């Protein structure tokens, strides 16, 4: 029994061990309560404004689109404290943990950005934070591991399974199954068991709310399409949510195509995986023919979640949103182009959304279109990745 619907059509649900059902029910109740509580809303609004830096800018990119009929705005989540959109919803989740009387936070992370966002929210709000990270990721993400440690978080390497994000996801749930009475699990994307896809969406929806107000102010109309990269789905659902009922507005989600869909080396389960049940939900995922869970590959280490939020799978099924993929090489070109023509270094994740917008423009340069890309994060973290490629190729 729940207060809210745990499904988006056939997708979603609460596929957790019986022992965790009360933790999910408790979380849902606290969320529903918080959402009607003007003091909760005001406290969240205050942190977002005065600590995280909202509202974020909406930047018109004139150099990139010169000579075409595309007008392109970037929603600047790269300017949020922490350097990515993840900060929005960890602040809301930290406040929910406090509302429930929890003193401890558990978080999973792959590339480390969610780990850093959870650590900074926990430091601000007086929560003791422990973060699980696959041992291969810990090895590859020293900068973020050290940021988490400077912020007072305990970073716990996970050596089981493939020692990456999915294995950290498991370990977080194993810990929670024994510690839920005192600890909140701060899940990092719009995925997992209900109520997380709903909570994560509602605590990211200011992205699209502000986008709508900002584009009405500048252009006097809604965008033709809003475009966002999709790892687990949080920044994309955050941009999409306030436009879902504006049926003229295209919603375009961009999954990583890695080395190319046909190579198998990609992270695009929504369009190229198979529905399974894992991490608390029924959703498309990266899996073997036998049903073992596999890794998502992308040049961008943050597009590593091996499935996709269930609301995205649902929006796709009904044709409300369209999903596409962009390869490593397309994302790298979009990265280089934004640096050179706009002086903004985008996260390689976000560079997937930008690459697809650039393609929309370049393929049909006399189509009149007003586009918004969600620039989900900054790309300072990616400059050596892009370096080790770009000079090793000229």
């Amino acid at each position: 029994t729940t207060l809210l619907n745990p499904y988006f059509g056939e997708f979603g649900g609460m596929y957790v061990p019986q022992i965790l059902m009360p933790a999910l029910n408790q979380l849902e109740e606290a969320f529903v309560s918080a959402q009607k509580d003007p003091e909760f809303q005001a406290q969240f609004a205050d942190l977002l404004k005065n600590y995280a830096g909202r509202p974020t800018a909406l930047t018109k990119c004139q150099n990139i689109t010169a000579g075409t009929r595309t007008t392109l705005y970037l929603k600047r989540e790269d300017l949020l404290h922490g350097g990515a959109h993840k900060t929005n919803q960890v602040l809301g989740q930290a406040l929910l943990a406090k509302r429930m009387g929890k003193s401890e936070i558990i978080a999973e992370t792959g590339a480390g950005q969610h780990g850093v966002a959870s650590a900074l929210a926990s430091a601000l709000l007086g929560l003791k934070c422990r973060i699980y990270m696959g041992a291969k990721d810990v090895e590859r993400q020293s900068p973020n591991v050290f940021r988490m440690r400077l912020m007072g978080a305990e970073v716990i390497p996970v050596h089981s399974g493939s020692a990456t994000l999915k294995d950290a996801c498991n370990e977080a749930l194993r810990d929670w199954s024994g510690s839920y009475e005192t600890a909140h699990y701060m899940l990092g994307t719009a995925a997992g068991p209900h109520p997380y896809p709903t909570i994560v969406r509602e605590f990211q929806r200011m992205i699209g709310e502000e986008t709508k107000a900002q584009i009405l102010d500048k252009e006097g109309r809604l965008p033709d399409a809003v475009i966002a990269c999709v790892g687990g789905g949080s920044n994309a659902i955050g941009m999409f949510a306030d436009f879902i009922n504006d049926t003229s507005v295209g919603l375009i989600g961009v999954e990583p195509g890695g080395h190319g869909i046909e190579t198998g080396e990609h992270g695009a389960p929504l369009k190229h995986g198979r529905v399974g049940i894992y991490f608390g939900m029924k959703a498309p995922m990266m899996q073997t023919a036998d049903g073992q869970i596999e890794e998502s590959y992308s040049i961008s280490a943050g597009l590593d979640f091996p499935s996709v939020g269930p609301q995205h799978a649902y929006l796709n099924s009904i044709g409300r949103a369209d999903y596409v993929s962009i390869t490593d090489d397309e994302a790298l070109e979009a990265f280089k182009t934004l640096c050179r023509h706009e002086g903004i270094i985008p996260a390689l994740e976000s560079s997937h959304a930008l690459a697809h917008a650039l393609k929309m423009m370049r393929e049909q340069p006399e189509k009149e279109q007003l586009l918004v890309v969600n620039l989900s994060g900054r790309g300072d973290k990616d400059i050596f990745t892009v370096h080790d490629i770009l000079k090793a190729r000229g």
Binding site: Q18, P22, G161
Partner: protein, 267 residues
């Protein structure tokens, strides 16, 4: 078939509890696992709980996480598990065989087809670890269509609604969890709440087997004394595998000694 019903009736006639070991199929290899399973049976196991190796066993502690990893190191697949299961049943006709599954392996290529393959190989029950009663409908229905008992979990804090659900929906046995957390011998659970055991009997639930953290004979006798029909032990058995990888002979000897002691405690 009626293998759990026949077992419990027999055990009740001998005023005896069930002792039920868990192992991961194919750990540390198919041939050794077949031998391990035969040794557990010869030493007095009343029934078996058998894990199919899964990449993401999120209800398992390190001991069983490592059992899954060993089986994958040996190339063990669900298809090979079903071959093993068919052979085990051909050797041992009456022992109840329960699978410990994760949802994706059941749902993967059709829930109905999964429970049909279980029936064909002679499996008696399936416990899908990451499907709570709230999500269980297509699993339990498919289980029952194919004469397989769907096993449900009764947490130590179960409220009345949940006890009534577990009692109505389950068959074979009711899994009584000894505590919160994940599998492991390093974490001992509670005595069964005599309240839960009695409410389950009140609602004509399938007989209860206590599991999680059961690693000693005293715990087995304590489960039975509290009114449970028996006790399951996994990590304690798998730890004997892990400790003796280098010595298959000693492994089987220690398995036999442990299972015998645990089964003796059920009498």
């Amino acid at each position: 078939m009626e293998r759990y019903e026949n077992l419990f009736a027999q055990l009740n006639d001998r005023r005896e509890g069930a002792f039920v070991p868990f192992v991961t199929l194919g750990d540390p290899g198919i041939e050794q696992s077949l031998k391990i399973i035969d040794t557990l049976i010869d030493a007095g196991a009343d029934a078996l709980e058998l894990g199919v190796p899964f990449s993401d066993p999120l209800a398992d502690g390190p001991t069983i996480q490592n059992a899954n990893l060993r089986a994958f190191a040996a190339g063990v697949t669900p298809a090979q598990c079903f071959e093993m299961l068919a052979l085990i049943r051909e050797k041992h006709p009456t022992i109840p065989i329960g699978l410990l599954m994760y949802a994706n392996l059941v749902f993967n290529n059709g829930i109905d087809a999964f429970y049909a393959r279980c029936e064909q190989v002679g499996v008696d029950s399936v416990l899908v670890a990451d499907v709570p009663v709230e999500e269980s409908a297509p699993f339990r229905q498919a289980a029952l269509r194919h004469n397989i008992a769907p096993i449900f979990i009764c947490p130590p804090n179960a409220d009345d609604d949940l006890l009534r659900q577990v009692a109505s929906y389950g068959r074979g046995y009711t899994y009584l969890l000894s505590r919160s957390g994940v599998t492991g011998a390093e974490n001992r659970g509670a005595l069964p709440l005599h309240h839960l055991i009695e409410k389950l009997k009140e609602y004509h639930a399938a007989p209860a087997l206590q599991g999680f953290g059961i690693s000693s004979p005293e715990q087995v006798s304590a489960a039975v004394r509290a009114g449970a029909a028996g006790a399951i032990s996994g990590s304690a058995i798998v730890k004997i595998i892990e400790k003796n990888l280098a010595s298959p002979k000693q492994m089987l000897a220690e398995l036999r000694s442990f299972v015998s002691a645990m089964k003796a405690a059920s009498r």
